[PDB]
Amino acid sequence: GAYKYLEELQRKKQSDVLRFLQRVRVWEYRQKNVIHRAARPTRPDKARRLGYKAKQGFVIYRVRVRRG
Amino acid sequence: KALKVRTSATFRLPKTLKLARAPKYASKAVPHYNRLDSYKVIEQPITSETAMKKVEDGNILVFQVSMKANKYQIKKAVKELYEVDVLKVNTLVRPNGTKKAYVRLTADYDALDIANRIGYI
């Protein structure tokens, strides 16, 4: 299962890989709306651990709250 | 590749197929009957001595019409019911909060003939 390799990789957030991906995705998300939709989960292993399934009815929604 | 010429510096929403509504079930399925029919339009006549003076003299019929009734619908109602050609219809709403209409007929029909036909004198 790729899900274990995803779960392990996603924890190392300052690994050269996730550093790059954080920088490019945070740009993609900031350019879209505040509360916009998501065609699929960005983290399909995190989603399904919280109870997401890949059947009709389940949705994902990306949302950005101001910090501070 | 070889992407199409665009003389416009603006992109606008491409036109797409506005599809017609085709419901699986009728909304009501039994349509309503005519709300204001002839008899709902023309409710009563007005038997006040002033209304009678105008019926005898002017060749006019003072009829108590509904609210939500067009001058067109009063003309059409009087013609269909009483069998008479209406020259004009002048409508005011009374201080009583009911409508009344001065149905003047063409020269062909004397209003007394149709007043006596209805019953009231």
Binding site: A2, L6, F20, Q31, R43 | R6, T7, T10, F11
Partner: protein, 233 residues
């Protein structure tokens, strides 16, 4: 001819209101088009880590063509072909009572991510095709490194759509040939050697080297001007 006279147009500054020419470079594109482009450019401009950059080197279009020609066979059973095979099997469960010996062993392509990951971990895979355009790359960033460590021959092939069309899905993000017919083992062996030349062998070197850090064409031309300034004076 005798009554029609040739004229200048004269599209200078003043004369002749400019003609409706191509403004396809200057179109105020929708924000979704503007964003999918600006993301593609920005992903190249920033320094790409060497484990992400290894997906830029996709398999060339003749080795790919031959890989897909072998992978065209062992296509997973269709909905019709499945139904008919089940009708023969389930009928033979009554007529003869000979089940699980009828319907001869299937040679199909193995696909789905969590399936093939486990086939590589158990070292049953003989060729693994890894897509280069998976929506969250992280799903696949680990797969060449796992595939090498286990010592399965793997190739980064162009198109998850192309893989999807091969497995009767829309996208597959991964494919794997774990078995083969005796006839077609020779082709697999050759194509495995030619893809090992590109990906497997060079993994240890490509592991070191970064992608991206590439300027836009206007800043490229400016640097080439500012470099010819000092040295090429």
């Amino acid at each position: 001819n005798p009554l029609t006279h040739s004229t200048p147009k004269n599209f200078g500054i003043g004369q002749a209101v400019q003609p409706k020419r191509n403004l396809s470079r200057y179109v105020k594109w929708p924000e979704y088009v503007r964003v999918q482009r600006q993301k593609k450019i920005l992903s190249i401009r920033l320094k790409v880590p060497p484990t992400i950059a290894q997906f830029q080197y996709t398999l060339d279009r003749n080795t790919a063509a031959e890989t897909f020609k072998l992978f065209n066979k062992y296509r997973p059973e269709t909905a019709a072909e499945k139904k008919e095979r089940l009708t023969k099997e389930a009928a033979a469960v009554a007529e003869g009572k000979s089940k699980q010996d009828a319907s001869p062993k299937p040679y199909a392509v193995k696909y789905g991510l969590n399936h093939v990951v486990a086939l590589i971990e158990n070292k049953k895979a003989k060729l693994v095709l890894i897509a280069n355009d998976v929506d969250p790359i992280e799903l696949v960033v680990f797969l060449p490194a796992l595939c090498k460590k286990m010592g399965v021959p793997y190739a980064i092939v162009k198109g998850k759509a192309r893989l999807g069309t091969l497995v009767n899905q829309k996208t597959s993000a991964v494919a794997a040939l774990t078995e083969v017919r005796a006839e077609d083992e020779a082709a697999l062996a050759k194509l495995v050697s030619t893809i090992d030349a590109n990906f497997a062998d060079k993994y240890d070197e490509v592991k070191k080297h970064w992608g991206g850090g590439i300027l836009g064409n206007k800043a490229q031309a400016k640097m080439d001007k500012r470099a010819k300034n000092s040295d090429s004076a």
